[PDB]
Amino acid sequence: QKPNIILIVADDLGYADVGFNGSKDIITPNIDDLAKSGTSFSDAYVAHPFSGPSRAALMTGRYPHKIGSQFNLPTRGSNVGVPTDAKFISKLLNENNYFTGALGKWHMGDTPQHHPNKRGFDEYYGFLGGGHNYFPDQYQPQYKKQKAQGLKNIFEYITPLEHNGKEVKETQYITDALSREAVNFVDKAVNKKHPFFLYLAYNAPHTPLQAKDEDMAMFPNIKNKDRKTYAGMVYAVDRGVGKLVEALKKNNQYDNTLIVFMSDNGGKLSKGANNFPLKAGKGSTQEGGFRVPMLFHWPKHVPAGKRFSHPVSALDLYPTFAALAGAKVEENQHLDGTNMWPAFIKNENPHKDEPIYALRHRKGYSDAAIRMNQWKALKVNQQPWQLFNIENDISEKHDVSKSNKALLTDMVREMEKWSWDNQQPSWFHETTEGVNWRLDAMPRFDKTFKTT
Amino acid sequence: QKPNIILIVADDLGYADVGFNGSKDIITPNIDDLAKSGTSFSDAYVAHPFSGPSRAALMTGRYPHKIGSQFNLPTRGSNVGVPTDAKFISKLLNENNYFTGALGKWHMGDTPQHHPNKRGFDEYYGFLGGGHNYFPDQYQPQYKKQKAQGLKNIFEYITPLEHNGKEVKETQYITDALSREAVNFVDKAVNKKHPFFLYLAYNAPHTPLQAKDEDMAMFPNIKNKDRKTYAGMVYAVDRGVGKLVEALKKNNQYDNTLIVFMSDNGGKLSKGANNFPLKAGKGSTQEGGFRVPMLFHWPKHVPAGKRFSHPVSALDLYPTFAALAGAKVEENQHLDGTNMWPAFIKNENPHKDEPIYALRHRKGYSDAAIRMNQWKALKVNQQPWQLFNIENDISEKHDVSKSNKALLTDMVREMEKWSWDNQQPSWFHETTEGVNWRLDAMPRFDKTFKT
Amino acid sequence: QKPNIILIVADDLGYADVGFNGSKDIITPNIDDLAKSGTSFSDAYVAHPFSGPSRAALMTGRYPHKIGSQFNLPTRGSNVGVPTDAKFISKLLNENNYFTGALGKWHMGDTPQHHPNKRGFDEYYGFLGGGHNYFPDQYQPQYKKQKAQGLKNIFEYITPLEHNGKEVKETQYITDALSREAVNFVDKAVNKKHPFFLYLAYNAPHTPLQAKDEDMAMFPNIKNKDRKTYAGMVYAVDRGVGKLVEALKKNNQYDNTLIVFMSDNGGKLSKGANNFPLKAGKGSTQEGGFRVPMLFHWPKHVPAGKRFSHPVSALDLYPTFAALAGAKVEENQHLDGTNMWPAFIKNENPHKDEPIYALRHRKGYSDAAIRMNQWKALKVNQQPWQLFNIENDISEKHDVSKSNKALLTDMVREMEKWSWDNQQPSWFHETTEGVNWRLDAMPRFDKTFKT
Numbered sequence A: 001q002k003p004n005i006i007l008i009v010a011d012d013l014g015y016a017d018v019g020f021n022g023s024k025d026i027i028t029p030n031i032d033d034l035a036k037s038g039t040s041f042s043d044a045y046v047a048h049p050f051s052g053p054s055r056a057a058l059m060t061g062r063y064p065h066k067i068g069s070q071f072n073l074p075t076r077g078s079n080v081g082v083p084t085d086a087k088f089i090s091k092l093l094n095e096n097n098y099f100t101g102a103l104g105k106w107h108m109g110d111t112p113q114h115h116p117n118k119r120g121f122d123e124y125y126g127f128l129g130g131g132h133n134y135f136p137d138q139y140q141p142q143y144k145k146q147k148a149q150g151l152k153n154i155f156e157y158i159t160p161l162e163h164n165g166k167e168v169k170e171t172q173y174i175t176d177a178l179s180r181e182a183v184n185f186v187d188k189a190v191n192k193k194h195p196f197f198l199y200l201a202y203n204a205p206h207t208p209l210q211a212k213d214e215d216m217a218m219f220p221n222i223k224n225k226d227r228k229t230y231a232g233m234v235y236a237v238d239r240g241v242g243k244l245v246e247a248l249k250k251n252n253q254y255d256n257t258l259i260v261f262m263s264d265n266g267g268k269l270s271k272g273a274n275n276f277p278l279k280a281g282k283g284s285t286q287e288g289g290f291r292v293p294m295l296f297h298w299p300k301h302v303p304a305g306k307r308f309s310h311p312v313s314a315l316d317l318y319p320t321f322a323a324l325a326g327a328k329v330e331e332n333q334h335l336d337g338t339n340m341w342p343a344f345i346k347n348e349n350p351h352k353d354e355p356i357y358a359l360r361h362r363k364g365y366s367d368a369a370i371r372m373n374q375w376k377a378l379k380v381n382q383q384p385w386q387l388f389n390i391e392n393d394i395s396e397k398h399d400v401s402k403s404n405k406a407l408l409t410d411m412v413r414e415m416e417k418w419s420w421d422n423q424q425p426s427w428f429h430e431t432t433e434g435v436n437w438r439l440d441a442m443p444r445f446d447k448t449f450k451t452t
Numbered sequence B, C: 001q002k003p004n005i006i007l008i009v010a011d012d013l014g015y016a017d018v019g020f021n022g023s024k025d026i027i028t029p030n031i032d033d034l035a036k037s038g039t040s041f042s043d044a045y046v047a048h049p050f051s052g053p054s055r056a057a058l059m060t061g062r063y064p065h066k067i068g069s070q071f072n073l074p075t076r077g078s079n080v081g082v083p084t085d086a087k088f089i090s091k092l093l094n095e096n097n098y099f100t101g102a103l104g105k106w107h108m109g110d111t112p113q114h115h116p117n118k119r120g121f122d123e124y125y126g127f128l129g130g131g132h133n134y135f136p137d138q139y140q141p142q143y144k145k146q147k148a149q150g151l152k153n154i155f156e157y158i159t160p161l162e163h164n165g166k167e168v169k170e171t172q173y174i175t176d177a178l179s180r181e182a183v184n185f186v187d188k189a190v191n192k193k194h195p196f197f198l199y200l201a202y203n204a205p206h207t208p209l210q211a212k213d214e215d216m217a218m219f220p221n222i223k224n225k226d227r228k229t230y231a232g233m234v235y236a237v238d239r240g241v242g243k244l245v246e247a248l249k250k251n252n253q254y255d256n257t258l259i260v261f262m263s264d265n266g267g268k269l270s271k272g273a274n275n276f277p278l279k280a281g282k283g284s285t286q287e288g289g290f291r292v293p294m295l296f297h298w299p300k301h302v303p304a305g306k307r308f309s310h311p312v313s314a315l316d317l318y319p320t321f322a323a324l325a326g327a328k329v330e331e332n333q334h335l336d337g338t339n340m341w342p343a344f345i346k347n348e349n350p351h352k353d354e355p356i357y358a359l360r361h362r363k364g365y366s367d368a369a370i371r372m373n374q375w376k377a378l379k380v381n382q383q384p385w386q387l388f389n390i391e392n393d394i395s396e397k398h399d400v401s402k403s404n405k406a407l408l409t410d411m412v413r414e415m416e417k418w419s420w421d422n423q424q425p426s427w428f429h430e431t432t433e434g435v436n437w438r439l440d441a442m443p444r445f446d447k448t449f450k451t
């Protein structure tokens, strides 16, 4: 019996904003249940410190730089997306007999060939862009007004949600709507004589900061307005996870389902998040930007009550899911992660003596990160490379590059070696960003990989 | 019975240079016959305001920017062309049982894999470059002299014409030569138990301005030397269309043949053309550069004596021809036009609430055009975006952008959205053009899509 | 019986550094034997004036610019290589029943899909980078020390050699080691009922200048330290050729084996080489950079004791080997050389009225070369195009461009035409080189093909 698989991804969820990863103010009982009876991950890294490229990496199992997807898609819409020649984990599972669903945020291409239904998902219910307004009673009138005015380029956050290409009129708070459709999906899966894969991509707690009064009422001792709204938004996700878990139990799916819960990137401190004890947040190559909460839950397979301390990459989920599903991986797919399960089961480092990378572009330069065993190499703000023993110095306070010159230089040269098959970006999130890229002769890797 | 299809394209034909589209001085009786007994199009647009990219769009059904073909091919020759992975309308029809011919101007690649015979044409008779000298007695001696001198890079306008890869020695005025081969092609098609597709690409009335004395004699009241030569050149095309039509009738092909006649782009005013009432001409994103004459003729299918007033794109011919031929279109072909026939038959707009675009690059900036319902948005000469109600203001005289700020902004943002899958050009028409493109960080779409 | 084929390539071997090509000080008796009983080539050209692109051209039969391989691979390692869609001569021969081996220097990609065993070589014994230190007793302790320190990016010149993906511990001087494995390969080939192809890629006489005392002792009258070391290194290659030849004779393979011996590029004057009488050396588009020593040896087929005076390209070896092996070449492979054997046998020019090109990129500009019949067109150091009658002026002393303006202009325009399907480089040898390429809007072919 092949297991069902559920990948739950929250959007801009801060490192300290779920109870199992150290939250003292936001309360996440249903998510914490999964942690307490499963394994959480203290050194879990996404492939990029923001949404689009991170999500591309999750789906393809490749660093987004390898497939021209290093930037978020154009904010006002486009006819491009994550390239079709990189087989999504969903398509691979669908080809090995899985019933497949995707819910909520896509952020990987609007067009027919980039649509969830052509990337291997039998079901899709959600919004295709970078986010969405949370209240239908707020957004539907705005959209109606603009459509009646003849406007064709409407802010994607107020546009109707869809189900398999057909527009719907959603009635509920979006987090709750997506949770309801998660229940509907796993309910539909009972009647199929097949295992299922569900990709549940919540837009919470991403902007705009919009919560239900009923969820905000549960945090009366949180005085800061943004933090209370944010706390409410996260609580809605927790309620949703509970509702999904309950449906899995009723359907007798729970015991044979691997649930993964994570964030797509680090939390944004100016929009209510907390990343303690990590430095900085969303978009950074500091730990706060791409080190995220993660838990696995699968009874009698994932040990209960444990805390896994070795590095794990979002890139690992593609080959790890494939191995558990009995799906063959071809070498021409160029997967950048590893099947982490053998090493996971022995409590060993699945990236022993192997680097994990982050490379985020800016105007005329790039910030970078290398995580390798106990070492974190850091390139930020055009300053020289820094080195931290991240196991003793999680907050990146003590640069020890002066005492380890050869090691750091070696780590950077390996990243330079790794960079040669990075593709030129196929798009940018804004027109001026792409113009500046060309004006500045990017990538300026002569600056990025300069050593000592 | 699947219909035969003939696409006749003239080269630099001005908007007012055929009788059915308002010519008062050039006379085009045989072309006008097709219009009078068919439907002409008052709002017909090509995909680019000059040859190579326009022709690539006709053949592929894709905006040339999508396939790296936004510029004319190198003037002195090259080993590149319209990419082989974009299936030509000719190949699609050939795969669905059509006998296929192409005549005259190619301008889409010289090399073996870019040659007409590898792009789905059973027959090809013509010249592969951007144009040709019209008189064999003039050009053949020039070529002979240069070949005997050992020169290998010879101006493509004097090089021998070819038939399916073998050089020929043409004897007649080129317009007449191509017309004769159109007759030969449809004559050969009688013996095949198949429908046929013919792509007749005349180089007239493109430069050099060379006409027969016999055709120029028919316009004694045209005093301007260039305009008289030009008029003659166009008259030769009209004679040719007549000869082709006559052959179709004799062969019992005429009633089951859809004939399309059009220009590849707007006329060039400094080389004898007239684009009245449109502003500017060849190469412009003003209407004069990419709005062209067009007619459909197909008895008992295309209504006789009509004038279709809704926008139509050259891009529409690919899926429209395919639907009529019963040829399936796969979604991975990424076609940018639409099958216009359903909407055409109901006299409705086949691009209702959908834009038609032109984007022509220049040195360090781009000019652009958007046609959407009654609206023409215009970006020219690095000035701010202008808006015209093109149905009331065909000559683009009255900028009404100040009264419609939100609408214009919306139209431009949609074009910006559309631009993201434009590919970097695979070539340029001159080396310095490509160098300047790279020096200037092109495309400078930050300037093109501002406000 | 299809013939066996051996391609022996030395690395940075100067033009005057083998006896048969005019050496007065370095003595190469075994290599000279092959010349004296075969044919040498006075006008043999590689496709690029340095290693990686030259080697890519040898293997693919294509100019390296056509396949994005105009630069050496990154010096400190990479996950890229000569593209997999360009079938190597080794794979073609392997598919037509040949037992295939490659020895020594690769310099065409480290990764699994770029590895010799996936590019059609049954056997590989060597080092995958741009070169190697010659003494195991010197390099193995350095590598051991650095590996134990935890370093993962180790200079490729001290890393272990490998045999079919498994690391080895080599005991001998590398030139001798590779010669020993050439003997082993042709010995293994006796037991196979198949012809064999062997690609023997010596790193000698490339840096570092490291020779055995026993080889240096043979040149007591060479006073210059570098020249003596270099002479020794070359003598080691000669000993190796002798050892291979002896094995071929013992195995009765010699008479049915075409042996080719050549250099990958011109010699480097600052590292012991001599290119007399050619101007300049390694990396240049002067003759000294890409005109190399070459000989063919094949008893009763290649005439004995001859000197072939017509141009021949490294690109020719792909289709020439294929024709002799009875292996079919598909037109979709886009081969840039020619099967030179028919013309070779008649003592005619296999590139009669056809150019041979060199195009080497630099910081913000490109140097170029055109060889066509008796003519050498030269573009160097950003100076204007020069023309030489290279048959009368091998040392490029007398620029005769003023007396042949039309001819030169024609040659350059043809090269400009040829350049349009050059691909943007897929990598560079250093990060700064790639940055400078983008900063300078390269290629600056406006400068390269001016006038």
Ligand SMILES: O=S(=O)(O)O[C@@H]1[C@H](O[C@H]2O[C@@H]3CO[C@H]([C@H]2O)[C@H]3O[C@@H]2O[C@H](CO)[C@H](OS(=O)(=O)O)[C@H](O[C@H]3O[C@@H]4CO[C@@H]([C@H]4O[C@@H]4O[C@H](CO)[C@H](OS(=O)(=O)O)[C@H](O[C@H]5O[C@@H]6CO[C@@H]([C@H]6O)[C@H]5O)[C@H]4O)[C@H]3OS(=O)(=O)O)[C@H]2O)[C@@H](O)[C@H](O)O[C@@H]1CO
Pocket (backbone or CB within 6 Å): A011, A012, A049, A050, A051, A052, A072, A129, A130, A131, A155, A206, A207, A208, A268, A282, A283, A284, A362, A363, A429, A430, A433, A436
């Ligand atoms: O009703 S309103 O909200 O008022 O108006 C809206 C709309 O605004 C909203 O749009 C979305 C939804 O909520 C907010 C709000 O502003 C906004 O949130 C954005 O959502 C995105 C997804 O839709 C995305 O989130 S993600 O998907 O999880 O990734 C956005 O995050 C990203 O934003 C950029 C793209 O990647 C990152 C960001 O990169 C920035 O790019 C800038 C250039 O454009 C700049 O780069 S640089 O110039 O090349 O250097 C910037 O760096 C700079 O930042 C400041 C300024 O200068 C310095 C520094 O001091 C420089 O470093 C760079 O960060 C990614 O964010 S990340 O945190 O960096 O990882 C997310 O913000 C309006 O947009 C619209 O006009 O109107 C509607 C109403 O109609």
Ligand SMILES: O=S(=O)(O)O[C@@H]1[C@H](O[C@H]2O[C@@H]3CO[C@H]([C@H]2O)[C@H]3O[C@@H]2O[C@H](CO)[C@H](OS(=O)(=O)O)[C@H](O[C@H]3O[C@@H]4CO[C@@H]([C@H]4O[C@@H]4O[C@H](CO)[C@H](OS(=O)(=O)O)[C@H](O[C@H]5O[C@@H]6CO[C@@H]([C@H]6O)[C@H]5O)[C@H]4O)[C@H]3OS(=O)(=O)O)[C@H]2O)[C@@H](O)[C@H](O)O[C@@H]1CO
Pocket (backbone or CB within 6 Å): B011, B012, B049, B050, B051, B052, B072, B107, B129, B130, B131, B155, B206, B207, B208, B268, B282, B283, B284, B362, B363, B364, B429, B430, B433
């Ligand atoms: O024997 S001779 O005729 O005396 O000499 C010939 C030959 O000349 C001829 O070559 C052809 C045949 O007749 C004429 C003649 O000059 C010429 O006509 C050209 O035919 C082409 C096809 O072969 C093509 O027509 S098309 O196939 O229908 O498209 C040509 O039109 C195009 O020309 C350019 C390429 O696309 C468009 C043009 O783009 C121009 O490019 C310029 C850069 O090189 C420049 O761009 S910019 O530098 O980025 O700004 C230019 O813009 C500028 O132009 C002037 C100068 O400054 C302003 C403006 O005032 C600036 O805007 C840009 O337009 C397309 O033209 S379009 O009208 O824009 O659509 C067609 O001209 C000689 O060439 C040869 O050397 O010798 C032989 C005899 O041996």
Ligand SMILES: O=S(=O)(O)O[C@@H]1[C@H](O[C@H]2O[C@@H]3CO[C@H]([C@H]2O)[C@H]3O[C@@H]2O[C@H](CO)[C@H](OS(=O)(=O)O)[C@H](O[C@H]3O[C@@H]4CO[C@@H]([C@H]4O[C@@H]4O[C@H](CO)[C@H](OS(=O)(=O)O)[C@H](O[C@H]5O[C@@H]6CO[C@@H]([C@H]6O)[C@H]5O)[C@H]4O)[C@H]3OS(=O)(=O)O)[C@H]2O)[C@@H](O)[C@H](O)O[C@@H]1CO
Pocket (backbone or CB within 6 Å): C011, C012, C049, C050, C051, C052, C072, C107, C129, C130, C131, C155, C206, C207, C208, C268, C282, C283, C284, C361, C362, C363, C364, C429, C430, C432, C433
């Ligand atoms: O122990 S040490 O030896 O001291 O140190 C070593 C190691 O150094 C060695 O590494 C190898 C082995 O011996 C030497 C030594 O320095 C070096 O040799 C090089 O081997 C390569 C293969 O491994 C390759 O040979 S080849 O495979 O046969 O091709 C090298 O030749 C090439 O080198 C460059 C790449 O292609 C050619 C060269 O191109 C150069 O590119 C430069 C940078 O971009 C520059 O280009 S430009 O700026 O754009 O114009 C350069 O031109 C310039 O050079 C100077 C400066 O400005 C002018 C000029 O005055 C400008 O023209 C251009 O040549 C090809 O050479 S070619 O001759 O041009 O064809 C071969 O040299 C160290 O590297 C390591 O770190 O340490 C170890 C010890 O630990």
Ligand SMILES: O=S(=O)(O)O[C@@H]1[C@H](O)[C@@H](O)[C@H](O[C@@H]2[C@@H]3OC[C@H]2O[C@H](O[C@@H]2[C@@H](O)[C@H](O[C@@H]4[C@@H]5OC[C@H]4O[C@H](O)[C@@H]5O)O[C@H](CO)[C@@H]2OS(=O)(=O)O)[C@@H]3OS(=O)(=O)O)O[C@@H]1CO
Pocket (backbone or CB within 6 Å): B207, B208, B209, B271
């Ligand atoms: O760059 S160069 O130094 O190499 O050349 C320079 C200059 O830089 C170029 O910009 C310039 O280019 C013009 C245009 O293309 C080629 C050249 O002439 C073209 O027009 C000619 C036209 O003059 C000619 O007319 C002659 C004339 O009347 C009829 C005809 O024959 C008679 O004998 C008489 O002399 O006809 C040509 C076609 O046969 C051609 O006209 S056309 O084909 O373009 O319609 C172009 O001029 S244009 O862009 O103004 O139209 O050349 C100079 C070198 O002089």
Ligand SMILES: O=S(=O)(O)O[C@@H]1[C@H](O[C@H]2O[C@@H]3CO[C@@H]([C@H]3O)[C@H]2OS(=O)(=O)O)[C@@H](O)[C@H](O)O[C@@H]1CO
Pocket (backbone or CB within 6 Å): A207, A208, A209, A271
């Ligand atoms: O969705 S939010 O970004 O959290 O907040 C917005 C709005 O702030 C925005 O207003 C414009 C558009 O982008 C920025 C600004 O230039 C953004 O502010 S910023 O992130 O601080 O730079 C906020 O003013 C309003 O109250 O709420 C909306 C969301 O509903």
Ligand SMILES: NC(=[NH2+])NCCC[C@H](N)C(=O)O
Pocket (backbone or CB within 6 Å): A347, A348, A349, A352, A373, A374
């Ligand atoms: N159980 C293990 N695999 N431990 C080693 C993992 C790497 C470890 N962080 C180190 O100090 O090198």
Ligand SMILES: NC(=[NH2+])NCCC[C@H](N)C(=O)O
Pocket (backbone or CB within 6 Å): C309, C310, C311, C349, C352, C353, C373, C374
């Ligand atoms: N004028 C001449 N063609 N001289 C002889 C040149 C010889 C040259 N190798 C050729 O093949 O042509």
Ligand SMILES: [Ca+2]
Pocket (backbone or CB within 6 Å): A011, A012, A050, A051, A206, A264, A265
């Ligand atoms: Ca996010």
Ligand SMILES: [Ca+2]
Pocket (backbone or CB within 6 Å): B011, B012, B050, B051, B206, B264, B265
């Ligand atoms: Ca034209």
Ligand SMILES: [Ca+2]
Pocket (backbone or CB within 6 Å): C011, C012, C050, C051, C206, C264, C265
């Ligand atoms: Ca070399």
